[PDB]
Design a protein around this ligand. Structure first.
Ligand SMILES: Nc1ncnc2c1ncn2[C@@H]1O[C@H](COP(=O)(O)OP(=O)(O)NP(=O)(O)O)[C@@H](O)[C@H]1O
Ligand SMILES: [Mg+2]
Length: 480
């Protein structure tokens, strides 16, 4: 039953070539058009040396071009590495070097973001004539399921981010299970919300495209106000929202504060990223009710997007009335979500422990971080041919079988919905000449430091220093 993520999409293209696949404010592509265009780019990428295990940087904005690019890389046999164009030059440059990327799929407006790069560059906005000269046919046997589909960077406590390596087989497994869990059909219209820097974008994109639904790319302007967000979702007739929990929190507050009606097309809201506030869940069910369906989805990047879900709209009133809203049960049978003690033994129900993930969900590992890999991706001592990923998440199984998230064992947090290792910021701040010791903590980010030879514009100095190294959400909003 061997399958690549793009084969899964290709099957769907055969089924419904003329359905709309992607839609943005600026235009649209049918399944056939998306496929043939990605095929053209893929064929070109092959002539540039892209083959299985080749890492291809992708530095694009959210656009039809982005989706063509991702699929092209996949069809070519390569694995993409998202290069968020809002990140500072120094970060993107580290990632390009760390990942040894020699092909970069980008656009002309981003062309000078890499401290200059000797690899091949493809600008999709300006080189389309050249790309249109390549074959429109599907490529064959470029990749196996164990080969990489993408390497996505996440925050590193030691001072630099690191790439999580995801193989097709775990991504395909996730997409299939999620299509069936959410009942995605050809009539669905899913809003693509999160940046491809975060692996929830893969869920949005591939769940939608591998089932024949229509993927609707959001604008930047539509999220800044909830009324705009809702109204736009109504204009687009969106059926599925995938929202960071922290944005969803905003949404629930604004729904009650105002008298805003959810779009009438909306049937499913998928949330995850962090602890959902039980009070806002109560507020949801009081003001909205059980439709649209609300689902809490949990997992880390290292277990391929998500491993567990809880249908919040299906919970009893008293199940919603605990200190914590459950994250639920395994997405599927080949994904194991354990709560284990410190010798990796399961515990009786209702006893807390650390969440470990096993089975088909696992990343291959971290890219070029052998110590970190060996430490987080452990050989299962009771099932020798298998691994367990150590999440750093504390949890417990309730007697009803549902999993509870109980917090972290460490200094990883969520700021604006994004994964942040506090030690990354701290490690980086320490590198500055007039910083001697530093502690950064939540809650959102406040940096506590003892200066070396302070001026009174130290705050503004460190904000510039961090501005050119870290993503904005990692920049402490106040200093002390
Ligand atoms: N539904 C949820 N409820 C509570 N916590 C959650 C939930 N989903 C994820 N988490 C937490 O978020 C972690 C995974 O975050 P992850 O998706 O890996 O980061 P990210 O938001 O994608 N940013 P990055 O990893 O830097 O690209 C888990 O280990 C949990 O700590
Ligand atoms: Mg994730």
């Amino acid at each position: 039953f061997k399958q690549s993520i793009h084969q899964l999409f290709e099957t769907q293209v055969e089924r419904t070539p003329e359905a709309v696949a992607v839609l943005s404010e600026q235009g649209q592509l049918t399944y056939e058009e998306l496929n043939t265009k990605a095929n053209q780019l893929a064929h070109y990428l092959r002539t540039l040396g892209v083959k299985s295990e080749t890492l291809v940087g992708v530095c694009v904005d959210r656009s039809l071009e982005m989706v063509i690019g991702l699929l092209a890389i996949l069809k070519a046999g390569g694995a993409y590495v998202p290069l968020d164009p809002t990140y500072p030059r120094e970060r993107l440059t580290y990632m390009v070097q760390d990942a040894q990327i020699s092909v970069l799929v980008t656009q002309t407006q981003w062309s000078n973001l890499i401290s200059d790069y000797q690899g091949q560059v493809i600008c999709l906005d300006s080189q389309w004539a050249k790309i249109a000269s390549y074959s429109q046919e599907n490529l064959v046997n470029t990749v196996n399921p164990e080969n990489l589909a993408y390497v996505i960077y996440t925050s590193g406590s030691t001072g630099k981010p690191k790439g999580v390596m995801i193989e097709h087989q775990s991504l395909v497994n996730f997409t299939k299970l999620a299509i069936a869990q959410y009942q995605i059909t050809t009539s669905d219209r899913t809003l693509q919300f999160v940046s491809i820097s975060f692996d929830v974008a893969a869920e949005e994109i591939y769940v939608t495209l591998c089932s024949g639904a229509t993927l609707i790319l959001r604008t930047e302007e539509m999220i800044s106000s909830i009324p705009s967000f809702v109204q736009k979702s109504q204009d687009w007739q969106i059926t599925v929202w995938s929202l960071p929990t922290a944005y969803w929190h905003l949404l629930v507050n604004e729904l009650v504060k105002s008298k805003i009606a959810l779009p009438d097309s909306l049937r499913l809201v998928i949330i995850g990223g962090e602890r959902v506030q039980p009070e806002l869940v109560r507020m949801w069910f009081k003001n909205v009710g059980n439709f649209p369906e609300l689902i809490n989805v949990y997992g880390p990047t290292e277990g391929t997007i998500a491993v567990s879900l809880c249908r919040l709209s299906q919970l009893t009133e008293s199940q919603r009335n605990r200190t914590e809203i459950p994250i639920g049960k395994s997405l599927g049978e080949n994904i194991s979500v354990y709560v284990l003690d410190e010798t990796l033994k399961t515990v009786p129900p209702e006893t807390p422990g650390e969440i470990y993930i096993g089975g088909t969900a696992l990343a291959r590992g971290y890219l070029n971080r052998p110590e970190l890999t060996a430490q987080k991706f452990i050989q299962d001592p009771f099932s020798p041919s298998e691994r367990l990923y150590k999440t750093g998440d504390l949890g417990r199984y309730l007697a009803d079988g549902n999993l509870e998230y109980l917090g972290r064992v460490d200094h990883q947090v969520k700021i604006n919905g994004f994964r942040v290792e506090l030690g990354e910021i701290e490690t980086v701040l320490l590198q500055h000449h007039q910083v001697a010791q530093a502690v950064v903590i939540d809650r959102r980010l406040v940096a506590y430091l003892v200066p070396h030879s302070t001026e009174e514009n130290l705050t503004v100095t460190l904000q510039q220093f961090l501005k050119n190294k870290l993503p904005s959400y990692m920049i402490p909003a106040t200093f002390v």
